[PDB]
Write an enzyme that holds these catalytic residues in place. Structure first.
Site, mmCIF file in Angstrom:
data_model
loop_
_atom_site.group_PDB
_atom_site.id
_atom_site.type_symbol
_atom_site.label_atom_id
_atom_site.label_comp_id
_atom_site.label_asym_id
_atom_site.label_seq_id
_atom_site.Cartn_x
_atom_site.Cartn_y
_atom_site.Cartn_z
ATOM 1 N N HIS A 3 0.850 -1.162 0.000
ATOM 2 C CA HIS A 3 0.000 0.000 0.000
ATOM 3 C C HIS A 3 0.897 1.226 0.000
ATOM 4 C CE1 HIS A 3 -3.901 -1.995 0.587
ATOM 5 N NE2 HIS A 3 -3.266 -2.848 1.373
ATOM 6 N N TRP A 39 -1.065 3.789 2.396
ATOM 7 C CA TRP A 39 -1.383 3.352 3.766
ATOM 8 C C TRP A 39 -0.202 2.861 4.587
ATOM 9 C CZ3 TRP A 39 -4.913 5.334 6.536
ATOM 10 C CH2 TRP A 39 -6.101 5.806 5.930
ATOM 11 N N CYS A 57 -15.207 10.552 -1.904
ATOM 12 C CA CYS A 57 -15.629 10.283 -3.258
ATOM 13 C C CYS A 57 -14.746 11.032 -4.266
ATOM 14 C CB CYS A 57 -17.103 10.678 -3.419
ATOM 15 S SG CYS A 57 -17.796 10.412 -5.051
ATOM 16 N N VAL A 58 -14.268 10.289 -5.263
ATOM 17 C CA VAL A 58 -13.545 10.829 -6.412
ATOM 18 C C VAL A 58 -14.393 10.585 -7.667
ATOM 19 C CG1 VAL A 58 -11.500 10.415 -7.922
ATOM 20 C CG2 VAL A 58 -11.243 10.569 -5.365
ATOM 21 N N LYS A 97 -5.847 8.096 -10.100
ATOM 22 C CA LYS A 97 -4.888 9.157 -10.331
ATOM 23 C C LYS A 97 -4.288 9.627 -9.001
ATOM 24 C CE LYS A 97 -6.775 10.723 -14.745
ATOM 25 N NZ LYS A 97 -5.863 9.650 -15.249
ATOM 26 N N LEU A 116 -23.516 7.075 9.222
ATOM 27 C CA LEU A 116 -24.517 7.459 8.230
ATOM 28 C C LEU A 116 -24.039 7.184 6.799
ATOM 29 C CD1 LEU A 116 -25.798 10.691 9.994
ATOM 30 C CD2 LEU A 116 -26.706 8.380 10.206
HETATM 31 C C1 LIG Z 1 -6.816 12.655 12.553
HETATM 32 C C2 LIG Z 1 -7.637 12.932 11.294
HETATM 33 C C3 LIG Z 1 -7.447 11.830 10.254
HETATM 34 C C4 LIG Z 1 -8.505 11.894 9.149
HETATM 35 C C5 LIG Z 1 -8.251 10.842 8.069
HETATM 36 C C6 LIG Z 1 -8.602 9.446 8.570
HETATM 37 C C7 LIG Z 1 -8.517 8.432 7.421
HETATM 38 C C8 LIG Z 1 -9.585 8.645 6.353
HETATM 39 C C9 LIG Z 1 -9.625 7.437 5.408
HETATM 40 C C10 LIG Z 1 -10.785 7.545 4.424
HETATM 41 C C11 LIG Z 1 -12.034 6.840 4.970
HETATM 42 C C12 LIG Z 1 -13.126 6.804 3.902
HETATM 43 C C13 LIG Z 1 -14.460 6.324 4.462
HETATM 44 C C14 LIG Z 1 -15.421 6.148 3.310
HETATM 45 O O1 LIG Z 1 -16.072 7.119 2.955
HETATM 46 S S1 LIG Z 1 -15.586 4.674 2.508
HETATM 47 C C15 LIG Z 1 -16.497 5.001 1.028
HETATM 48 C C16 LIG Z 1 -15.465 5.415 -0.012
HETATM 49 N N1 LIG Z 1 -16.146 5.894 -1.199
HETATM 50 C C17 LIG Z 1 -16.400 5.207 -2.322
HETATM 51 O O2 LIG Z 1 -16.069 4.035 -2.456
HETATM 52 C C18 LIG Z 1 -17.110 5.939 -3.447
HETATM 53 C C19 LIG Z 1 -16.770 5.328 -4.828
HETATM 54 N N2 LIG Z 1 -15.307 5.284 -4.977
HETATM 55 C C20 LIG Z 1 -14.525 6.345 -5.117
HETATM 56 O O3 LIG Z 1 -14.997 7.475 -5.128
HETATM 57 C C21 LIG Z 1 -13.024 6.163 -5.257
HETATM 58 O O4 LIG Z 1 -12.674 4.907 -5.862
HETATM 59 C C22 LIG Z 1 -12.270 6.343 -3.926
HETATM 60 C C23 LIG Z 1 -12.307 7.813 -3.497
HETATM 61 C C24 LIG Z 1 -12.863 5.478 -2.802
HETATM 62 C C25 LIG Z 1 -10.810 5.900 -4.143
HETATM 63 O O5 LIG Z 1 -10.186 6.667 -5.172
HETATM 64 P P1 LIG Z 1 -9.427 6.027 -6.449
HETATM 65 O O6 LIG Z 1 -10.044 4.688 -6.775
HETATM 66 O O7 LIG Z 1 -9.389 7.100 -7.488
HETATM 67 O O8 LIG Z 1 -7.946 5.643 -5.919
HETATM 68 P P2 LIG Z 1 -6.678 6.643 -5.843
HETATM 69 O O9 LIG Z 1 -5.688 6.228 -6.908
HETATM 70 O O10 LIG Z 1 -7.135 8.074 -5.821
HETATM 71 O O11 LIG Z 1 -6.018 6.230 -4.439
HETATM 72 C C26 LIG Z 1 -5.635 4.887 -4.186
HETATM 73 C C27 LIG Z 1 -5.490 4.718 -2.679
HETATM 74 O O12 LIG Z 1 -6.731 4.897 -1.950
HETATM 75 C C28 LIG Z 1 -6.950 3.757 -1.117
HETATM 76 N N3 LIG Z 1 -8.411 3.545 -0.978
HETATM 77 C C29 LIG Z 1 -9.272 3.024 -1.868
HETATM 78 N N4 LIG Z 1 -10.514 3.040 -1.327
HETATM 79 C C30 LIG Z 1 -10.421 3.598 -0.093
HETATM 80 C C31 LIG Z 1 -11.315 3.872 0.937
HETATM 81 N N5 LIG Z 1 -12.629 3.601 0.825
HETATM 82 N N6 LIG Z 1 -10.873 4.454 2.069
HETATM 83 C C32 LIG Z 1 -9.581 4.752 2.239
HETATM 84 N N7 LIG Z 1 -8.701 4.487 1.272
HETATM 85 C C33 LIG Z 1 -9.092 3.914 0.108
HETATM 86 C C34 LIG Z 1 -6.215 2.603 -1.794
HETATM 87 O O13 LIG Z 1 -5.874 1.560 -0.862
HETATM 88 C C35 LIG Z 1 -5.000 3.318 -2.361
HETATM 89 O O14 LIG Z 1 -3.969 3.478 -1.388
HETATM 90 P P3 LIG Z 1 -2.721 2.446 -1.331
HETATM 91 O O15 LIG Z 1 -3.324 1.062 -1.243
HETATM 92 O O16 LIG Z 1 -1.964 2.777 -2.616
HETATM 93 O O17 LIG Z 1 -2.017 2.744 -0.023
HETATM 94 C C1 LIG Z 2 -23.777 3.087 3.787
HETATM 95 C C2 LIG Z 2 -22.511 3.690 3.294
HETATM 96 N N1 LIG Z 2 -21.485 3.523 4.278
HETATM 97 C C3 LIG Z 2 -22.013 3.958 5.559
HETATM 98 C C4 LIG Z 2 -21.022 4.867 6.194
HETATM 99 C C5 LIG Z 2 -21.150 2.140 4.488
HETATM 100 C C6 LIG Z 2 -20.980 1.187 3.362
HETATM 101 C C7 LIG Z 2 -19.919 1.132 2.691
HETATM 102 C C8 LIG Z 2 -19.773 0.283 1.754
HETATM 103 C C9 LIG Z 2 -20.766 -0.624 1.436
HETATM 104 C C10 LIG Z 2 -21.914 -0.667 2.196
HETATM 105 C C11 LIG Z 2 -23.073 -1.497 1.807
HETATM 106 C C12 LIG Z 2 -24.326 -1.082 2.145
HETATM 107 C C13 LIG Z 2 -25.440 -1.732 1.713
HETATM 108 CL CL1 LIG Z 2 -26.945 -1.120 2.342
HETATM 109 C C14 LIG Z 2 -25.388 -2.834 0.883
HETATM 110 S S1 LIG Z 2 -26.695 -3.507 0.235
HETATM 111 O O1 LIG Z 2 -27.886 -3.069 0.709
HETATM 112 O O2 LIG Z 2 -26.734 -4.810 -0.026
HETATM 113 N N2 LIG Z 2 -26.713 -3.120 -1.324
HETATM 114 C C15 LIG Z 2 -26.575 -1.888 -1.887
HETATM 115 C C16 LIG Z 2 -27.664 -1.135 -2.193
HETATM 116 C C17 LIG Z 2 -29.115 -1.447 -2.072
HETATM 117 N N3 LIG Z 2 -27.211 -0.019 -2.658
HETATM 118 N N4 LIG Z 2 -25.876 -0.077 -2.623
HETATM 119 C C18 LIG Z 2 -25.275 1.151 -3.133
HETATM 120 C C19 LIG Z 2 -25.419 -1.213 -2.186
HETATM 121 C C20 LIG Z 2 -23.974 -1.541 -2.038
HETATM 122 C C21 LIG Z 2 -24.112 -3.184 0.504
HETATM 123 CL CL2 LIG Z 2 -23.808 -4.560 -0.531
HETATM 124 C C22 LIG Z 2 -22.993 -2.532 0.938
HETATM 125 C C23 LIG Z 2 -22.012 0.328 3.114
#
Ligand SMILES: CCCCCCCCCCCCCC(=O)SCCNC(=O)CCNC(=O)[C@H](O)C(C)(C)COP(=O)(O)OP(=O)(O)OC[C@H]1O[C@@H](n2cnc3c(N)ncnc32)[C@H](O)[C@@H]1OP(=O)(O)O
Ligand SMILES: CCN(CC)Cc1cccc(-c2cc(Cl)c(S(=O)(=O)Nc3c(C)nn(C)c3C)c(Cl)c2)c1
Length: 411
Positions: free
Chosen positions: A2, A5, A160-161, A168, A411
């Site tokens: 990673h 990470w 979210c990206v 990227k 949430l």
């Molecule tokens: C003290 C205060 C501290 C505050 C910060 C605390 C930590 C916060 C942590 C965040 C908590 C989030 C809580 C939630 O909301 S989890 C929900 C996350 N959102 C989504 O999945 C929405 C749909 N997906 C996307 O928008 C993108 O694919 C995201 C933005 C998720 C990744 O963008 P992309 O696909 O364009 O990738 P990259 O090239 O830019 O970057 C690649 C790097 O990112 C690492 N990666 C992938 N997914 C996640 C993930 N869910 N948490 C943490 N890291 C993740 C991955 O291992 C890799 O790192 P490494 O493996 O190379 O090391």
């Molecule tokens: C809630 C977001 N965050 C909270 C901080 C947590 C989080 C993160 C990552 C995944 C889950 C998750 C949640 C649900 Cl609710 C399901 S699901 O119901 O069966 N199917 C489903 C539906 C109906 N719509 N979507 C978009 C999906 C995935 C599944 Cl698989 C996965 C949740």
């Protein structure tokens, strides 16, 4: 490996997390003055933006990013469709720090390209009970109890990206900049959840679902028809019958929460949440914000008898866009929020939740197996799903716990 990470103050392997006994920070202790005052560098075509959460058009902009780019299922049939009202509610709790809402915009047209949000939470996150016991046996009680007091930390959500910008490396940069803004407010821990496996969860829990409207759930393919229901004549009437619910709640003395219930709800919630290893501590204001009903967003009911609030439950709404169907645009899902029972069995309180959610037009009820959510699964006819919600701390060593020792709803 990673590349990002591995550079961060988190446990790095499963093995590392299983050997941890005491709660505590991982990083070198630092100070606000140690933290850079200037935002992290990004490329010249982009800029950092702090959304105004009371500006309808800022909320709208975030809303659209998440509507088109947020979490999907693995088969890309569903995507979350958090409403604008839900987002103002989630992003703007009492004492929220505006600077903790971190966006990247395209400098030229101000198209929003990435978002991450942090909100304050007061969390109990000291050494879990079982380890504390083991520490007394070994003579290390004061060590085990060092960080027993609730801490004011950051709760991260909504990363979210934009799809056009994936892979990227923009997410590392977002996380670094959110971390900088949080540290500059003298906060050094964070809590977050994800459906994906990252280094390294302290807890993990499976999702559970309760059909309220199975005809729709089958049509959109959230649900399948049971193989045993095939050896029947018209299986859809059978599935409907199987999941049917009363049109009205069974507890006399159930009504909607009102502002005057705040103190009693807080008291019975805190008593209940207190018995879990990891859990939030809420003020009156936070109880009002997170639990008072809001149209389309959060639905809360109390059981009142002899003018005393003895039980309550809450649920909130997140619709999902149905990507591939034609007959249906949205899945209308209710999510089990906080609750507490003192006068009736939990399964009887939560049936009323299902009943209310069903009569208000929700299609399914969802929950993770945190709290005492497992205690009512079989009787209320919830089934396990595909999803696994993982819980993480940033900069906090914590032993591995069961999800039934978690009392924090995200949430
Ligand atoms: C003290 C205060 C501290 C505050 C910060 C605390 C930590 C916060 C942590 C965040 C908590 C989030 C809580 C939630 O909301 S989890 C929900 C996350 N959102 C989504 O999945 C929405 C749909 N997906 C996307 O928008 C993108 O694919 C995201 C933005 C998720 C990744 O963008 P992309 O696909 O364009 O990738 P990259 O090239 O830019 O970057 C690649 C790097 O990112 C690492 N990666 C992938 N997914 C996640 C993930 N869910 N948490 C943490 N890291 C993740 C991955 O291992 C890799 O790192 P490494 O493996 O190379 O090391
Ligand atoms: C809630 C977001 N965050 C909270 C901080 C947590 C989080 C993160 C990552 C995944 C889950 C998750 C949640 C649900 Cl609710 C399901 S699901 O119901 O069966 N199917 C489903 C539906 C109906 N719509 N979507 C978009 C999906 C995935 C599944 Cl698989 C996965 C949740």
């Amino acid at each position: 490996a990673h590349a990002f990470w591995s550079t961060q103050p988190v446990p790095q392997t499963e093995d590392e997390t299983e050997k941890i006994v005491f709660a505590g920070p991982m990083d070198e202790p630092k100070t606000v003055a140690d933290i850079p005052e200037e935002p992290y560098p990004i490329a010249s075509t982009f800029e950092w933006w702090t959304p105004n959460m009371e500006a309808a058009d800022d909320i709208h902009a975030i809303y659209e990013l998440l509507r088109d780019n947020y979490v999907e299922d693995d088969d890309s049939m569903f995507r979350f469709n958090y409403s604008e009202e839900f987002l103002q509610w989630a992003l703007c709790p009492p004492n929220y720090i505006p600077d903790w809402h971190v966006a990247v915009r395209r400098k030229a047209d101000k198209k929003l390209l990435a978002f991450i949000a942090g909100v304050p939470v007061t969390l109990r996150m000291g050494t879990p009970k079982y380890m504390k016991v083991k520490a007394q046996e070994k003579g290390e009680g004061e060590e085990a109890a060092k960080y027993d007091e609730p801490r004011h930390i950051c709760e991260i959500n909504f990363l979210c990206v934009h799809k056009q910008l994936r892979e990227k490396r923009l997410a590392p940069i977002l996380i670094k900049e959110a971390t900088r803004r949080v540290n500059r407010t003298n906060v050094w821990q964070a809590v977050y959840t994800a459906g994906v496996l990252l280094p390294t969860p302290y807890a993990s829990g499976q999702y559970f679902h309760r059909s309220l409207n199975p005809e729709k759930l089958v049509e959109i393919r959230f649900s399948g028809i049971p193989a045993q229901y095939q050896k029947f004549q018209n299986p859809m009437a059978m599935l409907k019958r199987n999941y049917q619910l009363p049109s009205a709640p069974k507890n006399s003395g159930l009504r909607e929460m009102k502002p005057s219930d705040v103190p009693q709800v807080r008291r019975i919630l805190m008593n209940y949440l207190d018995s879990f290893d990891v859990g939030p501590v809420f003020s009156d204001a936070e109880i009002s914000h997170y639990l008072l009903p809001r149209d389309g967003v959060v639905f809360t009911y109390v059981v009142e008898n002899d003018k005393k609030v003895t039980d309550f439950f809450s649920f909130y709404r997140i619709p999902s866009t149905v990507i591939g169907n034609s007959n249906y645009n949205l899945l209308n899902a209710a999510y089990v929020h906080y609750y507490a029972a003192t006068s009736i069995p939990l399964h009887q309180l939560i049936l009323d939740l299902l009943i209310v959610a069903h009569s208000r037009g929700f299609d399914v009820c969802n929950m993770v197996e945190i709290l005492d959510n497992r205690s009512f699964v079989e009787q209320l006819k919830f089934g396990a799903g595909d999803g696994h919600l993982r819980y993480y701390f940033y900069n906090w060593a914590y032993p591995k716990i069961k999800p039934s020792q978690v009392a924090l709803v995200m949430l």
